[PDB]
Amino acid sequence: KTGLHVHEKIKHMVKNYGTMITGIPAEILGQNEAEISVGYVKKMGNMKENIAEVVRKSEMTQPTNSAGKASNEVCDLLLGTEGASEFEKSSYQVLSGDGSNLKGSLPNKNLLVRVEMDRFNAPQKYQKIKREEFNPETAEKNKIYLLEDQLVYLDIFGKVIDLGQTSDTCHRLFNAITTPFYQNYILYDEYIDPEESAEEAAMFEMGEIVKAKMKNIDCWTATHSFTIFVPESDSEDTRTLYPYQAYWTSHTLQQWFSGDKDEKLSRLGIDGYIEKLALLGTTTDSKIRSSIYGELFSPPGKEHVFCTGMNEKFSPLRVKFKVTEVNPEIALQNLEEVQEFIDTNYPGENAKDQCELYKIKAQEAMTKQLEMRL
Amino acid sequence: GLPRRIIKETQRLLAEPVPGIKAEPDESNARYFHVVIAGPQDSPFEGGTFKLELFLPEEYPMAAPKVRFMTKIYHPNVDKLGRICLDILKDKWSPALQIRTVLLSIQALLSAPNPDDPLANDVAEQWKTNEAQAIETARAWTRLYAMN
Amino acid sequence: HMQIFVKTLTGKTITLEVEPSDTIENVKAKIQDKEGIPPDQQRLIFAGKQLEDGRTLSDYNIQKESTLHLVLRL
């Protein structure tokens, strides 16, 4: 019931204060937003009344919708800067097929899980090229390159990675592809038939060569980040978890807590959540992946359109987790320090007027900076 | 020099077009689809028919297809030019997506606007502000530019 | 080779070591290593213009002691 007080406390504070739980003075936000947003001011005319509109347009006091920043703020509040920094040093563990290692990493103590989810950023394009033509720095990145004597992959960093093909195979595939359009095309075209022509057989064979070689090339890049608070419970059949998350260009942690999606996903139960999380990484069906992604990571209400049509999850996903312990008194003390900071520097009879006063202070600092500079 | 993907996409789209979406190519440039989307039911755009152009780049399907609303429409996601602000067309385009998915997303966005992280100007601020008269000004735009 | 700085609205300044050859996605991976933020969410602004994922640092005329801005909203 004390870890439950921790959860209730952080939920209430995020819901009522948005970005103010970061403990950062409004003046700093205003000044740095003025420093980044001076090029957007109209350079002519009465610009004081013209910087008024750029200050009004600003959303500097709105909480971040970067999921990584939200996870960082949650870790800060729950572990202090020190325990957060030490949690940073821990290594992620890839989730198992059944998610059993995660549930085995959840003893009946106040726990914090941090999850990083990766896309498989495999190359989707190929191009014939001659070794004289090839310059890795300027060439297109994350792209397969077919040469007369070599088949390489130019990765996301610009490192040429050989695909273990002989000059005979490469010469055959290079000369078999004659059509001028297929000189710079895609790797896995559904409408290509290998038995129709020799060129399309070449393209299919190259596609499968790359598809097999990528199976052991680290194409994983991070696409999502969230946290999970699992408090201690009286039993084991009443214990529950609460996922905390923002989503890039979708919603803030504030909006997540407002729609109570933490409680909705807590109703799934520990095993109920972990099973879906593991299936997300193990499945091959694109729409099963899409529906689980939308159930778990969408803002409340948009579960059924989050990953449909164009946002369909076609890339294989992988879930990684790290777990540490939460001392409820440290978390409550951090939250109390944030609350006293807010009440002392931004007074008011309710959190809402305090948020507005914070916004006004930020806007005034931004105005003073933009004025003293122009 | 049209890839068989383009012509077989066209053949499967004529063999199966979207209800309410009529896409058929013209001959001076076969990469051009005179697409027409009528306003879905229960929408402020219902009863109107919005003509759009869909241009396949030569880099299709590596590059996303250009789609532009010819008709003017009051919506918090298309601008004055009619450039639809699906994030498909600039970044998050992949060859797994096709013309039919682009048209599907355009129709769905017509049935469900998004004015909170949008591209439109006073349209978007007035949509998040006052949904009622925003919907109704969209209704009037429909009755003016989309009925004939 | 080269030191660059990345500042954010929160006031935090982080220091990366890169080369002009380094792709933007490599800088995003370094920011991930130092701050745990997924690259798919980082916006990098130099001289008021987004840095695009296919390009490199030398494409944006980014040289030594330069300062970039990590935008984490939309």
Residue numbers in the entry:
A (entry chain A): 8 to 381
B (entry chain B): 3 to 150
C (entry chain D): 0 to 73
Wording from the paper:
Recently, two L. pneumophila effectors MavC and MvcA, were identified as structural homologs of cycle inhibiting factor (Cif) effectors. MavC catalyzes the transglutamination reaction between Ub and UBE2N, leading to UBE2N ubiquitination in an unconventional form. Non-canonical ubiquitination of UBE2N by MavC abolishes its activity in the formation of K63-type polyubiquitin chains, which dampens NF-κB signaling in the initial phase of L. pneumophila infection. Here, we report the structures of the MavC/UBE2N/Ub ternary complex, MavC/UBE2N–Ub (product) binary complex, and MavC/Lpg2149 binary complex, which provide important insights into the mechanism and inhibition of this transglutaminase-induced ubiquitination by MavC.
To understand the mechanism underlying MavC-catalyzed non-canonical ubiquitination, we cocrystallized MavC, UBE2N, and Ub, and solved the crystal structure of the MavCC74A/UBE2N/Ub ternary complex at a resolution of 2.93 Å. Following the nomenclature of the study of Valleau et al. 24, MavC comprises of a main domain, which is further divided into head and tail regions, and an insertion domain (residues 128–226). The insertion domain of MavC contributes to interaction with UBE2N, which also interacts with the head region of the main domain of MavC simultaneously. Different from other Cif effectors which bind Ub with only the head and tail regions, the insertion domain of MavC also interacts with Ub apart from the main domain. The MavC–Ub binding buries 2580.7 Å2 surface area, including four contacting regions. The deamidation site Q40 is also contained in this contact region, which may play an essential role in the presentation of Q40 to the catalytic center of MavC. The sidechain of Q40 also forms hydrogen bonds with the amide nitrogen atom of C74 (A74 here in the structure) and the sidechain hydroxyl of MavCS73. In the ternary complex structure, the density for the last three residues of Ub (R74-G76) are lacking, suggesting that they are not involved in the interaction with MavC. The MavC–UBE2N binding buries 2300.6 Å2 surface area, including three contacting regions, namely contact A2–C2. Interestingly, in structure of the ternary complex, no marked conformational change was observed for the K92-containing loop region of UBE2N.
